[PDB]
Homo-oligomer: A and B are copies of this chain.
Amino acid sequence: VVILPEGTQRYVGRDAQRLNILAARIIAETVRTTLGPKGMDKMLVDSLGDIVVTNDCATILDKIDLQHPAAKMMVEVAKTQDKEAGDGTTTAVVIAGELLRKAEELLDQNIHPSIITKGYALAAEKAQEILDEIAIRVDPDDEETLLKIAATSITGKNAESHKELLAKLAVEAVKQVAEKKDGKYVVDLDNIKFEKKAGEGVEESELVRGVVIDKEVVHPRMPKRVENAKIALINEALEVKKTETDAKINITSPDQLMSFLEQEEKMLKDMVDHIAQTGANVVFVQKGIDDLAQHYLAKYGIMAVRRVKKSDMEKLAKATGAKIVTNVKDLTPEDLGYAEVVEERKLAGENMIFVEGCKNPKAVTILIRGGTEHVIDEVERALEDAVKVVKDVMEDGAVLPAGGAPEIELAIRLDEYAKQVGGKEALAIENFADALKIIPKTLAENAGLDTVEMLVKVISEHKNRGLGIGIDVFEGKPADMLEKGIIEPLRVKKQAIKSASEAAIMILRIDDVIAAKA
């Protein structure tokens, strides 16, 4: 009896499970090659012929037009991992896929899904306790470890060629805009700006302790360089003001055509005169600046810039120390900010404004350079991750070794937790534990090593030498990730297991899929 519309597709029970799992697995496989130090990249081309070349899992899954629903749900694991910890986007998706693969073996063994699901929840919760226990507490601002966290982040990416320079820029940037409340640091990444410009190479990238703005000096006669700039920030337009209430001038005598025109000029000259009087020799305005206003500004030798982005005004304030004033009339010397140099400079032929040498900038800019626009964008993506993992360690003074060490550690301990629990749930906990091994595994795989062998050795060596024993892909054998400085924020593992677990459990609970005709 016709219940559903013609064209509606539907799968139930094993069908639903098999397809959902297979689709999540294929997605995971698709991106496992971006994982690690020998990670490779993808070139994505949308319908508009727009190109994206990247190593970033989240970006990849977000940019690809995915059809299958289970596949789409995997995009959420990467996106969340990304927002929360930066790195580990591939790891989360890869573990999710492997978790579902091991789950199916139990499904085919006729083990009820809720039992599998119960076991996975237990394993996931035990994994968080284990990660907290084995987490290496470090000094929130120890430039040493921070620099290590950064450099690790950048490894395996296009910009790894200059990981030392880039790591330095990121760590420095985070340290500078970091704010300490009471021993605990808090970091707002919005205070770190990334400015991009093709030209030169990635080597020439730099950290400006101030702000770099893609704008020009409004008038030709204004100074193109100011030494110890006294900076005024105004968001209101430097134009003839009109009331909010509707108004119109009623002219009744010829002498008024001039009196009103001179009044509007006077209003405009006073705004500029006021600015000058505060001692400001540099002015950034959010809205526009009329030609007349530009004229007096120049005559005063004051450098001005109009139509500045609200987000830039805010960074300018935080770096220079100036206070954004809404109406010019309220501008006072106390409001002015400072900058060792404010100068218009041409990059790749196009003018820009550098506000550098600020006292104790609370906002900073990393100027990215590179031989190509595509190179430029990927370097930016990598810097975003690097600055985020650095941030993570300053907010949570905890790190972990990489190389698959933590997942190997979890694998070992979860296996014993399974024995304590027993029953069919143990079968689920053990499978969850074995699933964690894809990380160590695909790390080797991507390096071109022998998966079966490497695992045997790493797990063995790990059992003999402890928590820091992971896989050194470059060397092709187990090693102490800690001694080698290959570490990552505790938050990376934690969030990855959380997102991977909850996604897997959700998919596992599905036994009926109903899709309407598109």
Q: Give the residue of B202, B244, B255 whose beta carbon is less than 8 angstroms from that of A502.
A: B202
Within 8 A of B (CB), among A418-435: 424
Closest A-B pairs by Cβ, 5 of them? A247-B249, A371-B499, A254-B263, A371-B502, A240-B244
| B292 in contact with A327 (CB, 8 Å) | yes
New contact pairs (19) apart from A3-B68, A247-B250, A375-B503, CB-CB < 8 Å:
A1-B22, A3-B27, A4-B64, A4-B65, A38-B112, A76-B374, A80-B348, A84-B348, A112-B448, A125-B161, A158-B509, A220-B324, A243-B260, A245-B260, A245-B264, A295-B326, A371-B500, A372-B506, A375-B502
Residues from chain B with a CB closer than 8 A to the CB of A260 are 243, 245, 247, 254, 257
- The answer to whether A505 has its CB under 8 Å from any CB of chain B is yes
Indicate with 1 or 0, residue by residue over A486-518, a CB within 8 angstroms of chain B CB atoms: 000000000100111111011001111111111
Of A45-53, A399-407, A461-469, the one touching chain B: A45-53
Interface assignment of A180: CB less than 8 Å from any CB of chain B: no
User: Which of the 9-residue segments A103-111, A138-146, A168-176 touches chain B?
Assistant: A103-111
Stretch from A193-201, A276-284, A301-309, A352-360 forming part of the interface with B: A193-201
Evaluate contact between B264 and A42: CB separation under 8 angstroms. Answer: no
In residues 10-47 of chain A, which contact B (Cβ within 8 Å)?
16, 19-20, 22-23, 26-27, 30, 33, 37-38, 40-47
Bound CA span A124–B202, Å: 12
Contact B513 A43 (CB under 8 A): yes
Q: Whose C-beta in chain B lies nearest to the C-beta of A325?
A: B295
Question: What is the CA–CA distance of A439 and B16 in the complex, to the nearest angstrom?
Answer: 25
Chain B residues near A79 (CB-CB < 8 A): 198
Whole-angstrom distance between the alpha carbons of A452 and B391 in the complex? Answer: 42
Which chain B residues border A241 with CB–CB below 8 Å?
A: 261
A252 smallest CB distance to B (angstroms):
6
Q: Which of B247, B372, B375, B502 touches A201 (beta carbons < 8 Å)?
A: B502
Shortest Cβ distance from residue A441 to the other chain B in the assembled complex, whole angstroms: 8
The reply to whether B77 and A371 form a contact with Cβ atoms under 8 Å apart is yes
Cα-based distance from A17 to B45 in the complex (angstroms): 16
Nearest B residue (CB) for A511? B40
Given the contacts A2-B68, A244-B264, A245-B249, A372 and B80 also touching, CB distance less than 8 Å: yes
Expressed in whole angstroms, the minimum distance between the Cβ of A43 and any Cβ of chain B is: 5
CB distance from A223 to the nearest CB of B (A): 13
Contact B3–A317 (Cβ < 8 Å): no
Q: Contact mask A250-277 → B, CB, 8 Å, 1/0?
A: 1110111111111111010000000000
| Docked pose: A502 CA to B44 CA in angstroms | 19
Rounded to whole angstroms, the CA-CA distance of A8 and B502 in the bound complex is 31
Cross-chain contact B510 with A41 (CB below 8 angstroms):
yes
29 examples of A-B residue contacts, CB within 8 angstroms: A1-B68, A3-B26, A41-B510, A42-B514, A43-B70, A43-B510, A43-B514, A45-B69, A47-B516, A53-B510, A80-B198, A112-B448, A117-B161, A245-B248, A246-B247, A246-B248, A247-B250, A248-B248, A248-B251, A250-B250, A252-B252, A254-B260, A291-B326, A295-B325, A295-B326, A371-B503, A372-B499, A374-B503, A374-B506
A447 to B502, CA, bound (A): 22
CB pair B516–A45 under 8 Å, yes or no, is yes
A198-B76 contact in complex given A158-B506, A424-B452, A503-B375, C-beta closer than 8 Å: yes
In the complex, how many residues of chain A place their beta carbon closer than 8 angstroms to a beta carbon of chain B? 151
Q: With an 8 A cutoff between CB atoms, is A55 at the interface?
A: yes
Cα distance, A180 to B267, chains bound together (Å):
39
> Which B residues lie within 8 Å of A23 (CB)?
1, 3
Residues of B within 8 A of A203 (CB): 125, 128
Q: Does A239 belong to the interface (CB within 8 Å)? A: yes
Q: Does A323 touch B at the CB level, under 8 Å?
A: yes
A378: chain B residues within 8 A (beta carbon): 506
| A164 → chain B closest CB, angstroms | 12
B121 lies within 8 A of A65 (CB): no
**B residues within 8 A CB of A161?**
117-118, 121, 125, 505
**Chain B residues, Cβ within 8 Å of A374:** 73, 76, 503, 506
A200/B325 contact (C-beta < 8 A), A4-B65, A112-B448, A317-B220 known: no
Which B residues are CB-close (under 8 A) to A424?
452
The contact string, 1 if C-beta is below 8 Å from chain B, for chain A 182-198, is: 00000011000000001
What are the residues of chain B within 8 A of A110 when measuring CB–CB? 441, 445, 450-452
> Which listed residue, B46, B326, B516, touches A65 by the CB 8 Å rule?
B516
Q: A513 — which chain B residues lie within 8 A by C-beta?
A: 42-43, 45
8 Å CB contact of A450 from B37, B249, B448:
B448
